Amino acid sequence: MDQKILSLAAEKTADKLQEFLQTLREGDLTNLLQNQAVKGKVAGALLRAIFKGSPCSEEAGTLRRRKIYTCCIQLVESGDLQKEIVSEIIGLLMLEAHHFPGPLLVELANEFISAVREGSLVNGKSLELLPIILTALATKKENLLSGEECKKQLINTLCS
């Protein structure tokens, strides 16, 4: 069920994709885990369409962006998937951690805190996003506590 997002991301941006995000609504857990289990190159042009469709200028792209990542961080850890698609997926999380507003990245970093406390971190490729978000937090010098203050408490919670 991927090929009705590839004919949407080819024509225009945020006129037919944004309407597909609110019409599907059912779950992006069965639309990635099984769509990689058939063809891994179908789990990398789907994310290069979902992220193009869900820009951070509106709220029904940012909670889509905040839902697609928490499941995409969970599946690279949980699953025992091929090492050419973990390099592809972590090569889309890195290429898209640049233009985030404040209070979503501290919550994603809290998910990362939760992963480091207990959760079975079978691969350290999930912690590859922890560098770039601590950069992108620091560059936003505005009260979301400013960027650097949130970063220092974040590093304190990582360390402790």
């Binding site: 190159k41 990398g44 290069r48 592809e88 090569g91």
Partner: protein, 153 residues
Amino acid sequence: MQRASRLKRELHMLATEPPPGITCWQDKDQMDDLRAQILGGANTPYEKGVFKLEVIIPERYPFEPPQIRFLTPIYHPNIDSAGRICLDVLKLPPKGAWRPSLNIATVLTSIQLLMSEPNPDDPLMADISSEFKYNKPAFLKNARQWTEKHARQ
């Protein structure tokens, strides 16, 4: 001196037992440096291409690696618009992996290996290393068109 004793086995060994898809002869223009032909790796966009390389042997060779460029234009992540190669065994330790346990053939094999398998973690061309990764067919299209204008005949 040592240059002569290596090059002697190597020139002779590249006329008698060169690696598959590969040849290397003492250049007819340049009777000091070596001309290689690496024939485009199977199931890569370089299929139907004959890629000429100049292998410059340094003076203190075999204490220094060979110095190789793609003289046939090549559309590739680890090869730029002037034929410069991102290769570990083209540099010395610790940045590189040349040592005397190797020879011109083992590296020219590692070159046909890199033509088939570009490394996206040593990009000379970020446009091609990205295209290779994120739009494989556009890289493979452009590299195959590349192979039809420059590596063809």
